[model samples]
Target: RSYIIPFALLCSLFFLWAVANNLNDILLPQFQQAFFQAGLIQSAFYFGYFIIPIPAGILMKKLSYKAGIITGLFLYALGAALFWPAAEIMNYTLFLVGLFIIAAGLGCLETAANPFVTVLGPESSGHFRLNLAQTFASFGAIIAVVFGQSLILSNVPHQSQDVLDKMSPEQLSAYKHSLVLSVQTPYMIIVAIVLLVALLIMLTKFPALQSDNHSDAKQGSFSASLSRLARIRHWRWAVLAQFCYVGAQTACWSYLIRYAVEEIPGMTAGFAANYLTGTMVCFFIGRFTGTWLISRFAPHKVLAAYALIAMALCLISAFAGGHVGLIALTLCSAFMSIQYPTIFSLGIKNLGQDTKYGSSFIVMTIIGGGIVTPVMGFVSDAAGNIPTAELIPALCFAVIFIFARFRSQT
Candidate 1:
């Protein structure tokens, strides 16, 4: 029972970060309309992700997990609070700043919590414990999308290009301001919730956690650590695989609303947002089902099979372009369910002394979301159709397939 309270609190942290992550999907679509560029807003959030993981891992190594978690919470709440000013000014760039700050906090949370949970209990049950906690993360993701559907998404379809083209300067300014307000409202609630949670954590006393494995190896310089990590083949491939997987997953979720509205005539952004909810639902189901499947098969083989299926689904979505395509796109989330955790496990499989440091690089690869999603957006913009942009994720899944299949052979 001693472990119960701390474990529960750590699980809540998992849910918190998941909410922040899924909120990006809703924000991408909403900000696309508000800022006139979906790619830029998506890129802005992930730039924090791109730059912060390594630094976060280093910070946690220098300080304690408790300090890291508290710091992360403060940044998250501050970012959410910034939405008020962003909304007041109706400034797209200011909103991006808020997103970047939130993402920075999320990076710290992820670096700290993942390791914290694993070491919370008996080593034998660690895997199972982490999986159970992550289920709440998936639950949190579903909540994020559902909340977005009801609270933030608008029933009215966005103005047509021709209508927008005809609007006077003042009229366009009013339209943009209303859109900014919609984005601001939900984040205000986030600020309140995050601050409350942060306060509670600050007041609570956490048990001191100490690692059992002690290494005599020197705590090398950062450059030397990178050199050491490069020597591990499994870790290298795992990093690459994770990079591709995150890119594919983020692109798939971020673009689903736009894809639905574009492919189906008369689909409002609010209505199309339901498809994103469906995607998250399938993703949640897949997490449970995929966990079961992993117990029954080799993890790499299962990942390969799922990647192959996702590749086919991406093609259908790219070329088919309708209800058939939308369904295909949504189902891809189910196949994506196992890739991230599986890749992380594989990456650090044998890095006994360096496992913690290696993890930072895997987390750092989350920048793939920032790198790939904007490219998908740019491609869609260049091609004059979102469906064609599905090609990018298809290519990404192909890389994951290669990693899984190749790793199995070796």
Candidate 2:
């Protein structure tokens, strides 16, 4: 019963971040933009994840989780607000700056959030508990795509680059502006919710958690905190697996629209948006089953099993190129659902004081989303077959499988 408010607050944070995270799927295609440009769009946003976590953890070492969360929330809103000016000016670079700031804030939130959620209750249920909270996280992704499909996506017909090249500059400029501005209203609503959440976090009371592994206790060399975690083998595997998992997740969702349009006759971009929502819906329900299973069986066992299924699905999608392949792709989300939270709970399981430090590194590996998407894009362009792009995620699942197996043996 104790810490219930903070627990609920943390779950809410998950929902909010997921909303921002998946909306990028919509943004990627809406930019009506390139293989390189496509990759660059996601990179700008996720790059924030690569940069911010270490310092956020450093601060968390000295202060309370509440402070880091509140700071993150404010930055979250700050990024949302920046969208206004960026949209008005119609500058894509400015738009990326806003995304980077939002992701940076989410990085701070995750650095504190993952550790905080596990310790919020009994250690035994940590994996199950996070899956439950992540259920709401998946729900947010579902809603983001559902609403994003209508709110952010335009029904206006998109022009091919070859055809667009012949248009007058003014018409082309106006067309692009319409697409970019579609993001404005939705983000304004997002900013308000984030600010409200931040204020609520401030007013609430939270316990100040001190760790045996932190700055005051160690009295160590400047780099000691990170170095300590480096010596732990399982935690390192968790980081690598997390890198692969995030990349696979991002790569799969980011290109789903292109895949459906190219393979399914009469499939529009808006129609493919429903498939992303469907994936999120599957992702959400998987957590309930995931939580139930973890309660009964070992989490590493569950992880290993799920990764194997996900790997097979990617391979199935690679060869089967129509509705059947898309179904295979969507089902991958159900298995991918529990991976992030479970890996995190297992990684930092007994870290005591170094929990925050450990959490920071795992969260930072989220750069895989940024880095891997481009790689997948390159594969698609090189192979001239979008379905073949599933190979990257298939390979990614192999790594995740290895990590889970390693954890099981350990």
Candidate 3:
């Protein structure tokens, strides 16, 4: 517990990273409106989030953790810088490119940070530590919703004026400046934190840990990792379980505001935005509580129970009040708060030292963002509805629940 202070510091940083990172979800609507784009073009944020960790994982093996983190920080800063040009161009592809870069940077940070929490203390307590770190992540997600409301959603009034032909070039330029400033300010703050951490890391001695210590490792090349995936008895199922959980998590965030705006009566963009923050707050509470609960119950059993509950809630929300539905959705976040860390630890339990590489492979499963979220959007678009389309995450949780029962135990 001596390392608890530093771990808490790291967790706070992790919270900010997650908030800033997930704001990309808010950007999708902004970008879609700005550029008149459709489908997964907006998903470049997650595409990058999902894609970068593989190389980042390899880089960590080759370099020190501090170096890898600093590199990711710089990349994130660069991505934030790209927002200026993305707004200027008002081109969808350029915007997506910017998002992609940020996600790539996030990948490196996440790859390093997740395991870093695990090794900070006793092995028996690793699960608890990861849960705590992830609670911060949930906190970050809450902050993003606040940011989205204050800057992006409320600022819609001003941005719409800029879109008007009568607005002077001066006014348009000012709007663009505001847009860039909003995103830039947060990430700039994050960039400063990254540098300070890097400096401290350079000056101090931090514990060194490796993946060889865990049980998730299996044999293969990058390509072989793919092939080896199916061959691993429980890993494939575990990964599938993870995929569903993650799909539900990210999709929920991405659409939360839209859900509020569409389903809730008299809900403004600002209120919808605040709803996401509320969901994240619930998520934070749930994660800390889940950590305590897991001590007395098997994680698999807890997750399966929650999954079933979440499925029922989703069904009820499909027909319920705007307030009731939103509440159900926010509460869903609390249940989802711990699945990633819990399932990950369980999946890698047998891999020994190989846990490092296996863990990163698991991290890469974020690519499900690209697959499921876009489908949710497309379905919503096709149906001319958001709530019904959101059934996507509900269905996803169902699959995860089934896997929790059938395959997770093996």
lDDT of 3 by residue, 32-95 (tens): 4432344455455555566667677666655645566777776776765666677655655666
Global Cα RMSD, each model = 5.0, 4.2, 4.7
65-122 per-residue lDDT for model 1 (tens digits): 6666788787777766777787777766676777678778877776656666666665
| C-alpha lDDT score of every prediction, in listed order | 0.74, 0.77, 0.67
Q: After superposition, how far is residue 337 of candidate 1 from its true place, in Å?
A: 1.6
lDDT of 2 by residue, 258-320 (tens): 999998999999999888878877787877688788989989889888888988999998889
Return the top candidate by lDDT: 2
Lowest-lDDT window of 10 residues in candidate 3? 211-220
State residue 112's C-alpha deviation in candidate 1, in Å: 3.0
**Ranked candidates (lDDT, high to low):** 2, 1, 3
| Native-to-model Cα distance after best TM-score fit, residue 113 in candidate 3, in Å | 2.0
List candidate 2 stretches off by more than 4 Å.
16-43, 85-99, 147-186, 210-222, 261-273, 378-384, 408-410
In angstroms, how far off is 311's CA in candidate 3?
1.8
Best by TM-score: 2
